[PDB]
Amino acid sequence: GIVEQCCTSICSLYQLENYCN
Amino acid sequence: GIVEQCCTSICSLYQLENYCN
Amino acid sequence: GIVEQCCTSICSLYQLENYCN
Amino acid sequence: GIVEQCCTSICSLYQLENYCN
Amino acid sequence: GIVEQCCTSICSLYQLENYCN
Amino acid sequence: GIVEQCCTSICSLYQLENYCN
Amino acid sequence: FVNQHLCGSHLVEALYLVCGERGFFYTPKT
Amino acid sequence: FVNQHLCGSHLVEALYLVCGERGFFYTPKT
Amino acid sequence: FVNQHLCGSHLVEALYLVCGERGFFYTPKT
Amino acid sequence: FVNQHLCGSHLVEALYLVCGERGFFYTPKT
Amino acid sequence: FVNQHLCGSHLVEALYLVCGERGFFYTPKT
Amino acid sequence: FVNQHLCGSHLVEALYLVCGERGFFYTPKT
Numbered sequence: 235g236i237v238e239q240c241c242t243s244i245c246s247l248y249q250l251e252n253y254c255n
Numbered sequence: 256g257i258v259e260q261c262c263t264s265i266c267s268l269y270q271l272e273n274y275c276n
Numbered sequence: 277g278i279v280e281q282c283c284t285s286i287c288s289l290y291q292l293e294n295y296c297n
Numbered sequence: 298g299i300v301e302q303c304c305t306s307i308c309s310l311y312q313l314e315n316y317c318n
Numbered sequence: 319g320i321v322e323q324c325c326t327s328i329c330s331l332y333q334l335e336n337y338c339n
Numbered sequence: 340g341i342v343e344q345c346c347t348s349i350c351s352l353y354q355l356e357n358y359c360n
Numbered sequence: 361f362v363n364q365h366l367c368g369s370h371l372v373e374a375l376y377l378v379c380g381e382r383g384f385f386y387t388p389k390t
Numbered sequence: 391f392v393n394q395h396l397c398g399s400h401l402v403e404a405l406y407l408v409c410g411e412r413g414f415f416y417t418p419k420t
Numbered sequence: 421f422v423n424q425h426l427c428g429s430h431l432v433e434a435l436y437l438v439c440g441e442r443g444f445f446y447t448p449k450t
Numbered sequence: 451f452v453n454q455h456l457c458g459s460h461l462v463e464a465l466y467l468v469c470g471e472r473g474f475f476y477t478p479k480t
Numbered sequence: 481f482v483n484q485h486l487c488g489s490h491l492v493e494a495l496y497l498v499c500g501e502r503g504f505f506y507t508p509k510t
Numbered sequence: 511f512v513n514q515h516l517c518g519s520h521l522v523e524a525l526y527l528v529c530g531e532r533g534f535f536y537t538p539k540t
């Protein structure tokens with residue numbers, strides 16, 4: 235999930251928008 | 256300036272990106 | 277809602293715990 | 298102390314209350 | 319006290335250093 | 340730079356002042 | 361625990377500490 | 391913008407930044 | 421609630437959260 | 451992304467997230 | 481160093497940076 | 511004061527603390 239995408243790996247601000255409601 | 260605008264009104268991440276190196 | 281209550285008045289960690297997954 | 302209990306190991310919010318005045 | 323002064327007026331890091339252990 | 344001085348190594352608050360404008 | 365007065369990012373920090381690995385939903389009005 | 395490692399509190403602060411008023415979910419187990 | 425690793429700034433933010441007005445001590449050498 | 455209302459340290463946190471490794475300049479008035 | 485205007489959690493963050501390993505006491509009124 | 515490791519967000523929070531109104535630059539590539 236997010237942890238894997240953004241913490242373990244790296245992610246963009248645009249990728250973070252994936253987790254908005 | 257940006258510092259003041261973000262606090263007294265609002266600002267976007269796009270505006271913030273102008274202050275990157 | 278919770279977001280608003282915590283900021284405009286007060287809220288407890290117990291109330292916050294309701295928003296956990 | 299706290300570092301060992303909560304950082305090196307893991308601790309609960311209730312354990313953190315141990316360090317309140 | 320310090321907590322109140324820093325928030326209602328201003329305080330220096332020098333004043334803060336008095337609260338170290 | 341700063342990362343090397345303060346993150347990789349350790350630095351003082353006075354050293355951090357080096358990066359003020 | 362004590363009662364809290366939390367605005368903006370500080371609410372999210374509290375949710376994080378409270379929920380930890382369980383995660384949480386942040387749901388502001390409008 | 392950039393790609394960085396964002397973990398724990400820092401990850402949720404970032405979600406708050408990007409989503410704001412929309413709200414978000416932090417679901418580390420998923 | 422949950423058990424997590426809380427270190428440095430994050431540990432003191434957590435103490436602030438839990439203790440608030442009561443105050444607290446952060447004594448890492450002890 | 452949403453618009454932001456950022457004072458004090460919270461502006462610096464946003465700059466950090468936005469710029470990452472590129473770095474940034476923090477330049478308040480007077 | 482400059483003078484500071486610090487409320488809530490931001491005071492605790494400053495104490496942490498100022499004191500580091502020495503630790504500190506956070507002692508608000510009432 | 512003390513010498514500690516300050517990295518990422520924590521490093522820029524520290525710069526904000528020490529520099530304030532003077533402003534600062536965070537230039538990790540330099």
Ligand SMILES: [Cl-]
Pocket residue numbers: none
């Ligand atoms: Cl960290």
Ligand SMILES: [Cl-]
Pocket residue numbers: none
């Ligand atoms: Cl604030």
Ligand SMILES: [Zn+2]
Pocket residue numbers: 400430520
């Ligand atoms: Zn951190």
Ligand SMILES: [Zn+2]
Pocket residue numbers: 370460490
């Ligand atoms: Zn704040």
